[PDB]
Design a protein around this ligand. Sequence first.
Ligand SMILES: *[C@@H]1O[C@H](CO)[C@@H](O[C@@H]2O[C@H](CO)[C@@H](O[C@@H]3O[C@H](CO)[C@@H](O)[C@H](O[C@H]4O[C@H](CO)[C@@H](O)[C@H](O)[C@@H]4O)[C@@H]3O)[C@H](O)[C@H]2NC(C)=O)[C@H](O)[C@H]1NC(C)=O
Ligand SMILES: *[C@@H]1O[C@H](CO)[C@@H](O[C@@H]2O[C@H](CO)[C@@H](O[C@@H]3O[C@H](CO)[C@@H](O)[C@H](O[C@H]4O[C@H](CO)[C@@H](O)[C@H](O)[C@@H]4O)[C@@H]3O)[C@H](O)[C@H]2NC(C)=O)[C@H](O)[C@H]1NC(C)=O
Ligand SMILES: *[C@@H]1O[C@H](CO)[C@@H](O[C@@H]2O[C@H](CO)[C@@H](O)[C@H](O)[C@H]2NC(C)=O)[C@H](O)[C@H]1NC(C)=O
Ligand SMILES: *[C@@H]1O[C@H](CO)[C@@H](O[C@@H]2O[C@H](CO)[C@@H](O)[C@H](O)[C@H]2NC(C)=O)[C@H](O)[C@H]1NC(C)=O
Ligand SMILES: *[C@@H]1O[C@H](CO)[C@@H](O[C@@H]2O[C@H](CO)[C@@H](O)[C@H](O)[C@H]2NC(C)=O)[C@H](O)[C@H]1NC(C)=O
Ligand SMILES: *[C@@H]1O[C@H](CO)[C@@H](O[C@@H]2O[C@H](CO)[C@@H](O)[C@H](O)[C@H]2NC(C)=O)[C@H](O)[C@H]1NC(C)=O
Ligand SMILES: *[C@@H]1O[C@H](CO)[C@@H](O[C@@H]2O[C@H](CO)[C@@H](O)[C@H](O)[C@H]2NC(C)=O)[C@H](O)[C@H]1NC(C)=O
Ligand SMILES: *[C@@H]1O[C@H](CO)[C@@H](O[C@@H]2O[C@H](CO)[C@@H](O)[C@H](O)[C@H]2NC(C)=O)[C@H](O)[C@H]1NC(C)=O
Ligand code: SDR
Ligand code: SDR
Ligand code: NAG
Ligand code: NAG
Ligand code: NAG
Ligand code: NAG
Ligand code: NAG
Ligand code: NAG
Ligand code: CA
Ligand code: CA
Ligand code: CL
Ligand code: CL
Ligand code: ZN
Ligand code: ZN
Ligand code: ZN
Ligand code: ZN
Lengths: 690, 690
Amino acid sequence: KHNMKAFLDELKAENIKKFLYNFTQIPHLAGTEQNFQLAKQIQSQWKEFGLDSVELAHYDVLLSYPNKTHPNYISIINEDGNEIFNTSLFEPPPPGYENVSDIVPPFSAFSPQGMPEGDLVYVNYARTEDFFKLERDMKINCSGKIVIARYGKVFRGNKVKNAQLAGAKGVILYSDPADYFAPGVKSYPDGWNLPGGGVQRGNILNLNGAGDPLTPGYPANEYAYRRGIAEAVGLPSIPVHPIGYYDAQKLLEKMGGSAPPDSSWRGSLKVPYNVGPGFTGNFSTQKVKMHIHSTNEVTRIYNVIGTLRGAVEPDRYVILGGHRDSWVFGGIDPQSGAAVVHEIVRSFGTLKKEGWRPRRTILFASWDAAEFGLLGSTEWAEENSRLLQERGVAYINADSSIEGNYTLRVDCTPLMYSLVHNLTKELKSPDEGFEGKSLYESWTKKSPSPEFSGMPRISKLGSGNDFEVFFQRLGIASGRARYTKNWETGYPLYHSVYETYELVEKFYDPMFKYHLTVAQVRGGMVFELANSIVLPFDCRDYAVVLRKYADKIYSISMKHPQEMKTYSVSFDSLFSAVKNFTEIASKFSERLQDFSNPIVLRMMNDQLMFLERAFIDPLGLPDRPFYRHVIYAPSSHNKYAGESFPGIYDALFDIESKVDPSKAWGEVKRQIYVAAFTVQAAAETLSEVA
Amino acid sequence: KHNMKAFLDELKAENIKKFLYNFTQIPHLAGTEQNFQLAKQIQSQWKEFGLDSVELAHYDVLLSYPNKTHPNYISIINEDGNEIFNTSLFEPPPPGYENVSDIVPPFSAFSPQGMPEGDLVYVNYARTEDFFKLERDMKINCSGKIVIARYGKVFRGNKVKNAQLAGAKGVILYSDPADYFAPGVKSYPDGWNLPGGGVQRGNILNLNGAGDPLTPGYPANEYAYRRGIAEAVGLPSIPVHPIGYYDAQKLLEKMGGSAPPDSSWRGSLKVPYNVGPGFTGNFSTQKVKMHIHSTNEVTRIYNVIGTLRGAVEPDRYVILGGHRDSWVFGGIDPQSGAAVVHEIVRSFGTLKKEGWRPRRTILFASWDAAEFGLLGSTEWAEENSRLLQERGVAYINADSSIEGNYTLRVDCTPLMYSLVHNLTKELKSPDEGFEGKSLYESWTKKSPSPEFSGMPRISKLGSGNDFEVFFQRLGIASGRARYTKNWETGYPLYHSVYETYELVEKFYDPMFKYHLTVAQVRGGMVFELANSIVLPFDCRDYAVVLRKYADKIYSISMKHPQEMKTYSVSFDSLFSAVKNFTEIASKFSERLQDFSNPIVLRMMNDQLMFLERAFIDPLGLPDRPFYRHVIYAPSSHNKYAGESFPGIYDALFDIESKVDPSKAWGEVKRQIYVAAFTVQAAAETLSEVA
Ligand SMILES: *[C@@H]1O[C@H](CO)[C@@H](O[C@@H]2O[C@H](CO)[C@@H](O[C@@H]3O[C@H](CO)[C@@H](O)[C@H](O[C@H]4O[C@H](CO)[C@@H](O)[C@H](O)[C@@H]4O)[C@@H]3O)[C@H](O)[C@H]2NC(C)=O)[C@H](O)[C@H]1NC(C)=O
Ligand SMILES: *[C@@H]1O[C@H](CO)[C@@H](O[C@@H]2O[C@H](CO)[C@@H](O[C@@H]3O[C@H](CO)[C@@H](O)[C@H](O[C@H]4O[C@H](CO)[C@@H](O)[C@H](O)[C@@H]4O)[C@@H]3O)[C@H](O)[C@H]2NC(C)=O)[C@H](O)[C@H]1NC(C)=O
Ligand SMILES: *[C@@H]1O[C@H](CO)[C@@H](O[C@@H]2O[C@H](CO)[C@@H](O)[C@H](O)[C@H]2NC(C)=O)[C@H](O)[C@H]1NC(C)=O
Ligand SMILES: *[C@@H]1O[C@H](CO)[C@@H](O[C@@H]2O[C@H](CO)[C@@H](O)[C@H](O)[C@H]2NC(C)=O)[C@H](O)[C@H]1NC(C)=O
Ligand SMILES: *[C@@H]1O[C@H](CO)[C@@H](O[C@@H]2O[C@H](CO)[C@@H](O)[C@H](O)[C@H]2NC(C)=O)[C@H](O)[C@H]1NC(C)=O
Ligand SMILES: *[C@@H]1O[C@H](CO)[C@@H](O[C@@H]2O[C@H](CO)[C@@H](O)[C@H](O)[C@H]2NC(C)=O)[C@H](O)[C@H]1NC(C)=O
Ligand SMILES: *[C@@H]1O[C@H](CO)[C@@H](O[C@@H]2O[C@H](CO)[C@@H](O)[C@H](O)[C@H]2NC(C)=O)[C@H](O)[C@H]1NC(C)=O
Ligand SMILES: *[C@@H]1O[C@H](CO)[C@@H](O[C@@H]2O[C@H](CO)[C@@H](O)[C@H](O)[C@H]2NC(C)=O)[C@H](O)[C@H]1NC(C)=O
Ligand SMILES: CCCCCCC[C@H](NC(=O)[C@H](CC(=O)O)NC(C)=O)C(=O)O
Ligand SMILES: CCCCCCC[C@H](NC(=O)[C@H](CC(=O)O)NC(C)=O)C(=O)O
Ligand SMILES: *[C@@H]1O[C@H](CO)[C@@H](O)[C@H](O)[C@H]1NC(C)=O
Ligand SMILES: *[C@@H]1O[C@H](CO)[C@@H](O)[C@H](O)[C@H]1NC(C)=O
Ligand SMILES: *[C@@H]1O[C@H](CO)[C@@H](O)[C@H](O)[C@H]1NC(C)=O
Ligand SMILES: *[C@@H]1O[C@H](CO)[C@@H](O)[C@H](O)[C@H]1NC(C)=O
Ligand SMILES: *[C@@H]1O[C@H](CO)[C@@H](O)[C@H](O)[C@H]1NC(C)=O
Ligand SMILES: *[C@@H]1O[C@H](CO)[C@@H](O)[C@H](O)[C@H]1NC(C)=O
Ligand SMILES: [Ca+2]
Ligand SMILES: [Ca+2]
Ligand SMILES: [Cl-]
Ligand SMILES: [Cl-]
Ligand SMILES: [Zn+2]
Ligand SMILES: [Zn+2]
Ligand SMILES: [Zn+2]
Ligand SMILES: [Zn+2]
């Protein structure tokens, strides 16, 4: 038989290991020859594996690179203009790689050039709440200052956006051991902790889902008309550079001015964590100077797109995609994901060579330039948006398979909750102490649901990964799964040169059993979405969460009862809409269970497929035209986090500070109307069609 | 048998006549009790006729009405502030109706209040070219003036928009006998010409497809959050009032200043048609004073929505819709259309009572408030947009069935050209001298195609009618057909109190044979769209027109060869896209002809249905977010006319006057890229799906 169990049994830990080794011997930075060579290799291998067609889809997009002959660095500058301390020009390379060529030194992609000279202010994580604390409580003025911020808690671009708007002329980002050095664990190469010379790379764009900064809305193809740099989307306006904690210590140790307001502002370094501005009396006349010479350059990128044509519904697409580009070796990010995708393609291909085809078409994607702002997946979706929104059933992402070895982590639409629960009950747990038990059992024990007994935690989707354009712009049901760490007690080497094959094989997953379990979850999801007669979506699960989200947004508003009285702010329409969605979903599920008629089936499969699509508003969210999903959007304060009813949430955020409360509460009421209307309209897609 | 011929044979001229009489005895102005009573009657009758369900869909939208106790009028005002002449307070009512209550006096809907006093400038038709001539050639300054313009040639709102931007403080609109009095024909009631006391009503909004000015994007339902009047969409900012030619003569006869530049500026009145500004020397000290007291008021409107559920594909909708609201009696506009819709519903119902159902669902609509800006159809489409864009096969409009008695007029998407040609070859011509000949033969003889021998003229769609939201915002294939006049040699009584049943029965269509022929065309189109196994769309016809439109836009650009050299403006991408569309459409048509498999059929019917949808750009046209179709949009100078490649056309329009030619030609290049990309993307929807 060719059923799911046949597909799953063909997946092998040893193959995943072989592929991971093969993908991580040299750097694969977006836009470089080595990453084009890897694209060609994967294209060739996916053809060998048995896919019907495998093509490269290329685009010419804005990328950013350091200048090879004028390196980026930061200085402490004395009274005379002598540079008395300089940060590192590169991370000490890991053992055995000290002669590998073309390792990109640490930099912040898309930083402008500049050499700003100034006094530091230390801004904790540079979160919006951290800036509120500085300015409103401590009365510290960031205007004209260089801010030094520690990484962690939110996406780094959001930090830079916050720093900009606070008036800063530069940002130094660093990794504090409080956030990236786990107690009792050795630094790389003898454990998985971050050494003092390690540095986290990463882009600092604020694109809000636009993709290539020069071509928002349209693919960056050969005839594309590009915005000028001055009109580009999302580019930072102040120089930015990341450093390690050895170099950060040398910068923080002289900080004067105000004490930290409290212990949540102190990291683990042996420094005062003084907020500034400026250094203590002896060194009051020294300043910090940035030297940033990186250049933005339109560069060709390549996606690999593999097709396994459906036997019955070839015009319905289930997509498994993850990126291929890495900052350096990509040991975890993304090659632990890409190796899993490669073995999934191999397994589907094995079944295909034996005469099997899935019911629906499966598309497999190896995306380029994800590290520079999800550029490869976004340009491809812009090029193919008409096909995807009329044919796209689901998107399963496949970036890093592991970020820890403790338990499963799943983030997905409520439409896939039942599918995930059912699949994980049929898979074996890889965990110690759970041998012979299901993955559902181990996951639920380690990561319990906050609301329900005997259920696991599943998170929302925001951004930060290649599902973003599919889910937040186009409204295609999306999910992701990986193995993760224990939060109760990014990983330390994230985006550093130390993310290697050896890191994974020695410290994360020596037997590749966690990788195998992730391959079974992602591959299993794809198999069920592409083969189940009725799409494996349960609309009643959306109804349950919509009520939770409506309760939660109402509770936020109810912090301001006088204003709700004054401006007549009612959530009655939104609760009515959610109640109607609940009733209609219940009736639809009865019909689905109770309907030989392939027209009624496909009519009902179309109602299932277009249900996620119904939460899209074609006008987008306010000043964010490419975030269109009314229920979820990436948080306006943290791209990594999903926010529910984002339009209403943003209208309420810090509302007590708004200068015209009538207008502000009017906008809250407008967002309640948009949300209530969208929920009711989605509900009505599930009604009998005529 | 229940086939098309059975449907068509059941339609009767005598029933159309009976219904037209029934619909036109009292006024049915949007928002009034009489028009709600008619909605209830139609709902009841459509139920009786056999529809599965018939509901009222209501919305609360901005309407505009005169003040019953402070009437609108225009004055000539002397030096002392004595009003020496006043325009009429109402049109003399037609014979037998002089005691009918609730006739709305002539007014311009949505005019603001005001009493501006000034000197006139006569602006011909107030077209953009007329304003160019005044300002650039004659150096006449409209700032602070009351402009008097004649109706005709373009939609009246576009006139008011032009007048506003020229700085005017008021607009007087009038009907010149050159445009509304056919030579040798008697005035109403003794012929179909416009009498001197007749006045054309009509709204003067510039909504650009938004629908209700207070709720753009979302239905004006019970919980809607409304913009303030100051933020409303499309409202004119200067007072506007329409008058007849007896009253216009009294205003024009004193005009001084400059002579008309040429004979195309002179109408038929016995006046000089002097452009002004102001009156001749004897009366130089007199001014014109407007008195406008109309009020905008949120008012409930009602659409009737009838459903005939499909037997095989109930989730595919073919829509026949036209409006019900009229300015006064609606003898032609819209009741000549609504009477045809009523007989079509009756005929489909007859077949339904005998056990027949169409293959796909047919929706029938009686729209409200079309006269106030297509409000009823637009709010309904906003409410149901998710259902329509995933299920909508086609929209056939049904406003006035006649505007003349000479020949057929069809405006539609190229996807319906073959369907119309085939249907009209099977229908009998109603025309004198063509007895026993087909309607195709008579139409083609009277209205030949410009480009092809032995083919009829079919026009493009713009706006001005209720197909606008379906076609231009949502991308649902749309069409319209009516009987029209001979252009080689609006109709005179358009939007006047003289549009009565007697007008039609005595002067336009005494036997109701032209109405019957229109019922066969519209009803026949609906029958074929709702019943044909394969959708009756021919993608190759789109390929032919796209090449014509690309040739035409290139020719416009080629008026500026130096600039195209300087800024490297190439249309190569657009021609490549059109060539690819041609090739792919040809291959798709081969597969369609050559494919027992209902999945392949429906897959291919989905490719046909979503082909119009592929021409929608989710970002809309520049500053017009609700006009989304890249191939067609209503002209930016005349809402009634369709324009092809509107984005490029507007970027080229008057480009030689732009102050920064680099930026202007950059925008032309951007629009060429958007157009080329959209054509290629539409083409790719017709490729094999996997
Ligand atoms: C959830 O689904 C329910 C349907 O089960 C749906 O109920 C609808 O609610 C609206 C109210 O928002 C009802 O609207 C009424 O319709 C009648 C005509 O049928 C009108 O006469 C009413 O207007 C009068 O009363 C108003 C309220 O006091 C006044 O503001 C107004 O000026 C009039 O005097 C009113 O429009 C509608 O009938 C029902 N439909 C039903 C029961 O089938 C509810 O709206 C759905 N929720 C959401 C968020 O969509
Ligand atoms: C109409 O359909 C045809 C397909 O039949 C399609 O042809 C495509 O055209 C593009 C050109 O716009 C081709 O792009 C080339 O792709 C190759 C790789 O396959 C690249 O190496 C090429 O880039 C080099 O050359 C460029 C031009 O001088 C340079 O600008 C560039 O820097 C590189 O040196 C180039 O990208 C593409 O291969 C074909 N696809 C085919 C033939 O299958 C055409 O685009 C379609 N029309 C529209 C409007 O979409
Ligand atoms: C990664 O694996 C690929 C696939 O086996 C290797 O590429 C092959 O290399 C051999 C011998 O050098 C060639 O004969 C084949 O043509 C290649 N096949 C391809 C590209 O599909 C590649 O060498 C491996 N890389 C590493 C670092 O081990
Ligand atoms: C930090 O780096 C800078 C740049 O390389 C060093 O400054 C340069 O030193 C060289 C060697 O003497 C001189 O030729 C240049 O004139 C210097 N450039 C300057 C001062 O801007 C600097 O000495 C380094 N500091 C430390 C502590 O290594
Ligand atoms: C997950 O598994 C459950 C348990 O089998 C499925 O629920 C059953 O579905 C069948 C077929 O429709 C019904 O006959 C049963 O009554 C259901 N049992 C329940 C609800 O306890 C469920 O459909 C699966 N989810 C998927 C496939 O997405
Ligand atoms: C238009 O026709 C309708 C439908 O026949 C007439 O309405 C009917 O009037 C009769 C007698 O007055 C009532 O018994 C029915 O209940 C009505 N039927 C409906 C409303 O569906 C209406 O009178 C006609 N109007 C004119 C002006 O002739
Ligand atoms: C035009 O209409 C106005 C408004 O009705 C007339 O002016 C009014 O005349 C009455 C009757 O004598 C006076 O009571 C008001 O004081 C007048 N209002 C004014 C002058 O603003 C005016 O006479 C009419 N002109 C003609 C020629 O009929
Ligand atoms: C209009 O009528 C023509 C003539 O019958 C149709 O074209 C024929 O379609 C059949 C069935 O696919 C083909 O076998 C013939 O070769 C076609 N004849 C031609 C092109 O001359 C055409 O499809 C009809 N258009 C519709 C139904 O939209
Ligand atoms: C356009 C908004 C996102 C910015 C593009 C880079 C995205 C990149 N993503 C990542 O680095 C992701 C984050 C995650 O999903 O855990 N890393 C992994 C291991 O999945 C970044 O954070 O830098
Ligand atoms: C929002 C843009 C259109 C404005 C709404 C009123 C539309 C109204 N339409 C009409 O009066 C139409 C015009 C036509 O299609 O021939 N009249 C008829 C007889 O069909 C108007 O012109 O006044
Ligand atoms: C890189 O820096 C060198 C000098 O170190 C300079 O000559 C060159 O212009 C730069 N490269 C760029 C900007 O691409
Ligand atoms: C912060 O300091 C600078 C002094 O350079 C000043 O110009 C700016 O307005 C200040 N912002 C405040 C006080 O909010
Ligand atoms: C793998 O799990 C073990 C046991 O809990 C632990 O000692 C080790 O630190 C884990 N590795 C990582 C990278 O979390
Ligand atoms: C209409 O005009 C009368 C006086 O003629 C005035 O009292 C009333 O306010 C007006 N009605 C409105 C503005 O609806
Ligand atoms: C038109 O005339 C007015 C005089 O009231 C003037 O203010 C305005 O600027 C003029 N416009 C021109 C000359 O373009
Ligand atoms: C109807 O057609 C006849 C004959 O050509 C013509 O005399 C009459 O004017 C037409 N009526 C209208 C309204 O065009
Ligand atoms: Ca783009
Ligand atoms: Ca609206
Ligand atoms: Cl992932
Ligand atoms: Cl029409
Ligand atoms: Zn990644
Ligand atoms: Zn990453
Ligand atoms: Zn009309
Ligand atoms: Zn009209």
